[PDB]
Symmetry: C4
Subunit: 219 residues, 4 copies
């Protein structure tokens, strides 16, 4: 039977059947958005939803026998596993994000279409040659975040009161989002020299990010 299923699973129709479900269940989830639609077709969809989870667990179970250890060593497969696994955790007990994280399964469209896998892989492959910079930056943030917590969090504890808060605020300044009226102008009303802290920060963090981009435009 091994070769029987290995011919069922490895079949085009099998694959094309899965993709057809994903696009369908994907459509169905944009409908579960409507409060109106749920009051008219909620059950239609909730069963349709419970159905697909099996078909996908059936699929994932087959796929494992046909592949054994080769499966748990495949990124795309591992993914599909974990995503389907999340959707298996019962509706009620635990966190309620798990109900929401179910929609992560639409990323199977990525996993189950080679044209997607290409672009995704092409993207990810750039990350290794960025880790040195990414590490640098994180170290940088961490140092400034600490300085900021102890420079401004007594008078400005919403923004800088905690090391985590400073991280977020510093992130916000790095995206250049409402950084002067929204953050540094207020701070100067108490700390006139705060610009000595945030302008260099902006220079460094911006410089780094141009390199990181230009780094990518070479490799």
């Amino acid at each position: 039977m091994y070769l029987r299923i290995t011919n069922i699973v490895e079949s085009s129709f099998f694959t094309k059947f899965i993709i057809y479900l994903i696009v369908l269940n994907g459509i169905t989830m944009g409908l579960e958005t409507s409060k109106t639609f749920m009051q008219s077709f909620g059950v239609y969809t909730t069963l349709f939803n419970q159905i697909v989870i099996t078909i996908f667990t059936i699929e994932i179970i087959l796929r494992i026998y046909v592949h054994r250890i080769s499966f748990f060593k495949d990124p795309w497969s591992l993914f599909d596993f974990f995503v389907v696994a999340i959707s298996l955790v019962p509706t009620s007990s635990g966190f309620e994000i798990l109900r929401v994280l179910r929609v992560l399964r639409l990323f199977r469209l990525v996993t189950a279409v080679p044209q997607m896998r290409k672009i995704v892989s092409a993207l990810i492959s750039v990350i290794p040659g960025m880790l040195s910079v990414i590490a640098l930056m994180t170290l940088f943030f961490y140092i400034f975040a600490i300085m900021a917590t102890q420079l401004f969090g007594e008078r400005f504890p919403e923004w800088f009161g905690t090391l985590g808060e400073s991280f977020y605020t510093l992130f916000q300044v790095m995206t250049l989002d409402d950084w002067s009226n929204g953050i540094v102008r207020p701070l100067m009303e108490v700390y006139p020299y705060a610009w000595v802290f945030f302008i260099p920060f902006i220079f460094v963090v911006t410089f780094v990010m141009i390199n990181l981009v230009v780094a990518i435009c070479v490799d």
Copy 2:
């Protein structure tokens, strides 16, 4: 008579005449903006406005006798057709945006003058090498738009209460516009972990976009 008009249509003077009307009718539409001007010389304008549309339909009719099927397989010719057609629909009545969409005829300046054509073509021609990425993103937005609608739309239904609104808000965050004081900081007053949702979103979307930019430079 074919070869008569074929020489009229293909004549330079024909083209230059058209290009002259466009830059003329263009200047007219900018004057039609002044409420003062219209109280003064509106009639002068509005009739001059109808005239141009006739000439341009005459022209478009001629250009069809001289090209037949080759016409309706030409983007630029199709454009002009679909643009002139709009401006032919009477001033009435259901949607009055049609009166406004008339100004799209000034894009004939692009269509008639080469070099413009050149640049527009060079711009457009970059698009197909991006579609794989665009589709990836659109799928991304769709997934997060859904997660957001059901994570935040009950307390925050201006921003997230509907799939469309979430699309809009997620777009706004992608342009990095007022994203932290304007949207995520509020949201954290109720949902402290909302940064777990938007910081990753920002990273992905930003990352993706840098690649897309660089992807263009490859070509």
Copy 3:
């Protein structure tokens, strides 16, 4: 006498004597900024200014004898000339920006120092390649600015009430500056479909702009 002065003008002293005044007059203009400093040494620096203005006319005259027609065909000299003329229009009458345009002379440091000219020239020489795009865009803006004036101007005259206002607001949206909370969201409280107008606009304008940037990477 021609060759006598032609040896004075061409002299390293003369040229460096000028650069020396510019750096001096520049320092003095930032000093003229301090309301306090003017109450102490205002008349010093007021004379010192007219002094430099003579020396600079004396120079520009000598420079003309030595170069004649060649001088009025030099960008840097033409500039230097025009920036000195502005500083000569009496400290009164007409407009009083002329008192302020006098600070434009410190751009002589760009002229009087090579390398600077190198960089300014390197920068400028990129423009001609851009003009096809810059024309396309300007035509683009002009079309959309019209549509906006006549779509939002009656209810939103501060932002769109006049062709110029719409130009200004569209620019502000192009820089992605407070475009959604500050403009489109208000607009949608009256015109729910306004997103149909500004999202495409942003896509275009951002797309076009990336290409233009990538154009300057064709070198």
Copy 4:
């Protein structure tokens, strides 16, 4: 004794011992952020701090013997000196920023780990071929910062009342932060033509910055 310590200092254990301290002290400085943690274990980690600071001077004192004048001509070594030296200035007197500047020691993880060193060097090495542009801009700013101080600082002293404030506001405009609603729309309520000052400014500064980035994708 020279060769003895020249073999201790130059040892792998020495380096990996120092790095182990940094990552340890670095963790300790994030914990000194928690006001809670300090009412409990503040004493432990305050002593732990002076301990590391001794070890770091011992280490720095050694390293100088083994290197002499070669040490003071090492960027990376000079740094470590300066940063350890700052942590030496007594926890009193002068300013309290010195206490905060102590956290700069965590940059030793950069100085004392290669790859980091490599990455930091790669970044810094791009700077020299930017100095001309940086100089151009810094000159540009200065001219406009002056022009703005005297065009807007009487009516708008918070933003432009002083050369420095104009520098600050002009920087903020350069990062495109809340530039139109936050600064220029207000300004046009008194100075309708102020757009003639900030739009050209934005073009120039943006243009230049695209080149500076394009430069780094040449060199």
